[model samples]
Target: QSDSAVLQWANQAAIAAFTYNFVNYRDELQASSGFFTAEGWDQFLGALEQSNNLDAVKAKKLVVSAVATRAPIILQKGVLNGRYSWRVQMPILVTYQSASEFTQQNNVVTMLITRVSTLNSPRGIGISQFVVGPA
Candidate 1:
């Protein structure tokens, strides 16, 4: 795929992976799973699991919404071990909301996207690595 197309996919994947609604967190996460490779999915889940107080968030009804603030930038693009790959950087605005607290954060989400020859991905693209950090 072209770099722009790959970056577009990565942008949407980053937003979906980062956004969550406490009421349906698992479902929302599941919806985004197809955007990743198996290892990437596990890593994504682990990162979120460790970073958040899930029990507390559930009890407090925390909802997080992430929006890509700009077009994703392609940091690198090449072939790796026979598969096409790209490292993309996406700027995002993340909002955290609950009954008592509301906050927004500026963050950057980086992803290593790969072209996958698999039945699961119709577009032949998947995220192999994902990371989120302060902008």
Candidate 2:
């Protein structure tokens, strides 16, 4: 049951984390912050600030949409620091659209999701690590 729960949550989390419009990128990212642990959120924001193409997006008025192309696969699962943990991977199709340009890419997104003992998370799960790369 926990496996299925995490899988379902991961699907939406991927979309929320990857989809954004230049007009409200920060808002979009912050809206999804609840899906991650505090440390994970900081890491995610740090990575984005370091490597994001936000300037291009803003200049070009781009909108990015991401969708999970397949169900997430559980790569590993066990206990970490006494909490249940899972590493899962999913394929995502991401598209960037602007008035004059449109680009699409197939990327693989992986996340380390862990069971949280706190009541703040609705599903008792929070992502501790996340990565996206060419599929």
Candidate 3:
């Protein structure tokens, strides 16, 4: 018996495209409260950085399939913000044991995962596996 490795392409395209429009959005916010330094926002970022249990808790409780990751999110322009909001994308890597957990967060319409990609490679050659997001 031996080990196997798998790999998936990264979302480099989305990352690039976002850079153009995202700046204008963040600029406005930065002038006021600094997107990364707001009230609740900081707490969230801290959770991502300091809490190892954060992901495990969410994953086990099944609040989310997984704590894909957590980071500042840069939201694209939409009708709500009047202008686009560029902060960071907490790209959650999630899954459902069944259909139960999926429908539970019905009210959380705003929490969206920006992209879903996978990376699988040998022990060190590529992404063995990773989940980056906040609960």
Candidate 4:
């Protein structure tokens, strides 16, 4: 029971997933986790295609938030288990919104800086909002 807006967001989510699958970060997944199989990636994308909800982007952003904050610990934990740093894709699912503040304060942002990777690292080392992504 998705509205037009939700369906549009779902399509955006699918695009984000498709784009990320081939990014520099994905190579890390190859060495990082048993769960990160090619089939798993396919399933991830397939699920996205089947979904028509607003959480699509919000969910992915949740992972972005967590990775920004706790990726180091998660990655380290994975290394302890003899896994690559990228194996944990940590995809997220989020949605269900209602209220006046909803549009004003629905999205949550998480930021993390790491020297180990080029893409995820922050450009400027200074105070800033998490600014998760576009509204």
Model 1 TM-score, all chains together: 0.90
Highest-lDDT candidate: 2
C-alpha positional error of residue 46 in candidate 2 after TM-score superposition, expressed in Å? 1.5
Query: Which window of ten consecutive residues has the lowest lDDT sum in model 1?
Result: 51-60
Which lDDT tens digits does candidate 4 get at residues 1-135?
122332232233322432322123345333322222333345444543565332533443322112121111112212322322221112222332233212222222222211122233222111111113322
Model 4, residue 30: displacement in angstroms? Answer: 19
Query: Which candidate model has the greater TM-score, 2 or 4?
Result: 2
**Candidate 3 local distance difference test against the native:** 0.27
The lDDT for every candidate, in the order shown, is 0.83, 0.84, 0.27, 0.27
Q: Which segments of model 1 are wrong by more than 4 Å?
A: 53-56
Residues 29-135, candidate 1, lDDT per residue (tens digit)? 78998999878788887887777645655877888888888888988889987988898998999888887988788988999888887687888988888888887
Runs in model 4 lying further than 4 Å from the true structure: 1-15, 18-37, 54-76, 79-135
Residue pairs that clash (backbone atoms under 3 angstroms), model 4: 28-86, 29-86, 31-84, 32-84, 32-87, 33-87, 55-94
Better of 1 and 4 by TM-score: 1
Runs in model 2 deviating more than 4 A are none
Residue 111, model 1: Cα distance from true site in angstroms: 0.2
Q: 1 or 4: which has the higher lDDT?
A: 1
lDDT tens digits, residue span 41-90, model 3:
44434543584433443444433233323332334422232321222233
lDDT at position 97, candidate 1: 84
State in Å the error of residue 110, model 3. Answer: 13
**Collision count of model 1:** 0
| Candidate 4 lowest-lDDT run of ten | 122-131
